Write a protein that binds this ligand. Sequence first.
Ligand SMILES: CC(C)[C@H](N)C(=O)O
Length: 424
Amino acid sequence: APTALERVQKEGVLRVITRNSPATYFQDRNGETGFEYELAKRFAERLGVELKIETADNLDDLYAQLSREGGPALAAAGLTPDASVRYSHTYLDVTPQIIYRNGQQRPTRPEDLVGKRIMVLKGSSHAEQLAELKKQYPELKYEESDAVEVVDLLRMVDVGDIDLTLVDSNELAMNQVYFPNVRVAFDFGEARGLAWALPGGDDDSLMNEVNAFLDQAKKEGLLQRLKDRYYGHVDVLGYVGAYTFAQHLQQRLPRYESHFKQSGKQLDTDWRLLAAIGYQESLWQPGATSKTGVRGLMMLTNRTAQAMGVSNRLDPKQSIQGGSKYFVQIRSELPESIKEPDRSWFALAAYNIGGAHLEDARKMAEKEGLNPNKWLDVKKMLPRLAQKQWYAKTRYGYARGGETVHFVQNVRRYYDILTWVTQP
Ligand SMILES: CC(C)[C@H](N)C(=O)O
């Protein structure tokens, strides 16, 4: 008579069903990832079992697998919370948002959905929301598809195939950086928690382990660290900066993508990181120049150019080649036991602020009894290079070490964003 929990533990596998969606589960360079994947993999680790993911064709399929004997133990799928289905405690507050196309008539309230072409996923809480609206306004028309994901409905608004969709704010935020013409019209409802779904029944053995995991996850910052990483683009970049990234990805990157990729091949370095640097430096503009005679797409000094054999810094190919050689060389000089990924984040700090001021920040880390080989500690020190109190105590004095923390954070975020929609 094994409980749900004992079943898992005896099989030594946790089978989780999810959506095929950026917001939940997909693959990158290093394998499986995504918010729900990472969250569910820490749950399987907690239980001491192997995670096995299944994906459903659509939401009705996903809820049908859960009600099957022998099916998945739980669904982790950005689900908005029937004896056939039980929900965990909620783990993230998301708001349903009506999405429209920039430059078209912004709907401001529910009645404005009438006369608009509107599609949502079949079997979704979105479709239920609309079903309730239609009882009030019979003239409301909307279509449901079970052949599409949410990212695909956002693309339909983006390219103009539909006027409107309804989507959770965390999904909007994640994908706002890819669709330059989608905008939030308004919030169709207030924030509400997402929850994992479990098979119905009277056995609360796994449900209680799920809820203790989510409790822990909130306690330690795990949910918020995952949310900032995948869903945090608008909070960190601003709304305008996130959609502007979409513009520049669609209209600028294609002119340089192959340059970036050749460099990556040449230097055995992920090309999306190199493109991320270019984005943070110039917004992928070959002509950009600064005050201090640093220029071109990657922002190279004349020395760097000379050292790197770059004739013309206004040539993008050239600037990318030398910028990317220079990043990789900086990264190579760092002390050998500093490992990836920190190795790369230190290299990004150095690219921006230069080896000297970095060294001072690492020394300051050590004098504070923090670790100078630990990125997070050195990060804590860098902003101090701009505070008088602390740059007084440094060999090379004042530097814009707050800008440097922003540069590393953004490059990391841009790199993520490019990774999730491009090939290695
Ligand atoms: C899955 C998504 C579309 C939404 N949260 C829902 O539960 O239907």
